[model samples]
Target: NLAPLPPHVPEHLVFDFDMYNPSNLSAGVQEAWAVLQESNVPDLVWTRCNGGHWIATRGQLIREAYEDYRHFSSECPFIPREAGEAYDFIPTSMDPPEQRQFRALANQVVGMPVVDKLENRIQELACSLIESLRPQGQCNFTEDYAEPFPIRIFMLLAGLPEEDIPHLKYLTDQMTRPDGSMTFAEAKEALYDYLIPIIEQRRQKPGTDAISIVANGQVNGRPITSDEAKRMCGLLLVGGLDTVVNFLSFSMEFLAKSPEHRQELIERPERIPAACEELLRRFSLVAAGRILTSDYEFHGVQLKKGDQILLPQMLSGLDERENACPMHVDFSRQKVSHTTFGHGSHLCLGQHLARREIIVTLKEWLTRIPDFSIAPGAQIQHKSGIVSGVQALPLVWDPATTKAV
Candidate 1:
């Protein structure tokens, strides 16, 4: 039987704002969630989409929910009912104790040391991609740089061929954005089909690549099961496909619009990390959550068991109650904190690699095309889903203005 929302949740709070609607999608999403931030709205509200669920608007509440996993389970992390049911990725969908074991295994592959090893390759790829577009002086930033750069890096890390990207990326996109061509079941099958062979091949003759490492590695003293390995690898592919790609576009758009911020980074290359932090805080990209195991009272509202709660990995800290003038991007803001990666046990494992990529792009791109903006009369569109992103960013610049360092 389906679970129901607790007694105190207001009826409006239980309404599901169809996220799949394409009407002014970018703005509509922000408005829908931001409405929860209104003074009249409760901290926790129920929604009827994908089975009834709840949403936590404040940072304190959301953070607590994520930290208190005993009450909130990650086994089914998505909303819209079906996606959540089908989500069985290791580490992400697993709660602590059990979750901890697989997380350690995942760390062995994408952790800091591995990220450090890939730094040069990431930088080289970013520069090579930027230089190719630098000459054109006019290019679609999202299609040209943002999408390919991170995916290629992930493909390299996974030891997968670039040729497999189109198929895999499409499947990954459906899981989050759901383009309507395939239902959640179809998407899951497609992803499993792609991963099973890769896992099988890697297990036979393991290599040093990330996929091979996970496929051949042990979890809790036994070799990882083929299904478990495939699911884990699928998560990695989705994580890479979604996170950095959206982040790259968001960072670029911010830099394009804010000349002073760009100039600050240009003048002090070492400040790129700080710049990345501020950008991450300001742009907060990823959205994720887990299911509730039992009825719980939060801020005077009762949330029933089995209800899905979206802890939006990126939402909190953007609220003024959490940060000063939350919308403004202040590079020097002291004690800047947000769950852009995630909070508590679910904090992003690949964050180090993501930071490295951002830092490298800031340093290298500025050294080449120091100044650029969206092409004249070109409309910039943003897309929203589990990951918020720019649909297309047309940038144009005068080649003569940029000089190589």
Candidate 2:
């Protein structure tokens, strides 16, 4: 149901784009969102969907909004108003200065050093997962590889059991892509309930695990309070579970459809890293935005205070102005620019780990299953939300073509 537009919102600037469910989602998530950039649409528009909000449609407005957080606050990052109101994930929900301390503690857990320490585990897991699927000849890439590889490694890092994945992922999914089963408040409360005990346990007897590190870690010379610890860890869990998991499926789906691109990487293995960058740009996915802190004239459009504007990180790179032929994946594309991880002070802490996981998956998967395709008659479908994702990827390859290594 669309909300009534405020008087400040011009009639010409209204385009009822729903964040949870886009009209063209079935065509593809990115394509669906690209509708915002069409000539008829303005650079900044108001949508009555999900409780009436503003949307920055191009890279310029989006970057300006994100970098200028004074006007665009992170206090309410999600849409549907209710979800954003309940979204209190540490570092993500807080603005700078205050945001800095929590980010440092979070970095201690998922930042570069942690990835470096877990390098062997990351490589081994990718190889092990790929090797197992090699003999299958055919597999659902999303379920068999994407979810398990990243989630298992994360569980190991957090000192949580793999068995709890189903429950945890379900609640996490509800927050971003609600299935009509639970409100955002209910989902946030459920996640808090799940983390409360874990945070308490970690606080009492700290371990080297990520959760324990955050649980007992200091922020700005003060011990992070129990509530703060839970908020931080909750952000970590969602990042670990959702971000890379969906991204892998999108990357793999692209590889499955574009064999020529696959051959490019297979022939020039050195290009894999560059290819990974290009893929991240082409398949950029996170779409979380910020709320307006004050009413102001932005690029000639009037925005009222408290109005939320979606600065989709996914759109920055996809805009033709940012990248020529934005849809086409070019490994050699120079100066690749995008906010895939994010921009400004709130840049993603798990990015280093994310890159390692992605690069390893590309290298290991290609080395083993060098040649594969979408299973005949299987239509790949994508779901859109804060984090857009492929629902399932049924890939098929000849068993004889696969290697044991």
lDDT by residue for model 1 over 275-377, one digit each (tens)?
Answer: 8998888788666777879988767776777777888766686766788787788878897878888998978899998898888888888889988987888
TM-score for candidate 1, please give it. Answer: 0.94
User: Each model's C-alpha lDDT?
Assistant: 0.81, 0.91
Q: Which residue pairs in model 1 clash with each other?
A: 13-46, 14-46, 50-80
Q: What value does the lDDT take at residue 126 in candidate 1?
A: 89
- Residue 56's lDDT in candidate 2: 89
- On residues 193-306, what C-alpha lDDT tens digit does candidate 2 reach at each position? 999998898888889999999989899999889999999988998998899999999999999999999999989999998998998988999998998888899999988889
lDDT of 2: 0.91
Model 2 per-residue lDDT at 294: 86
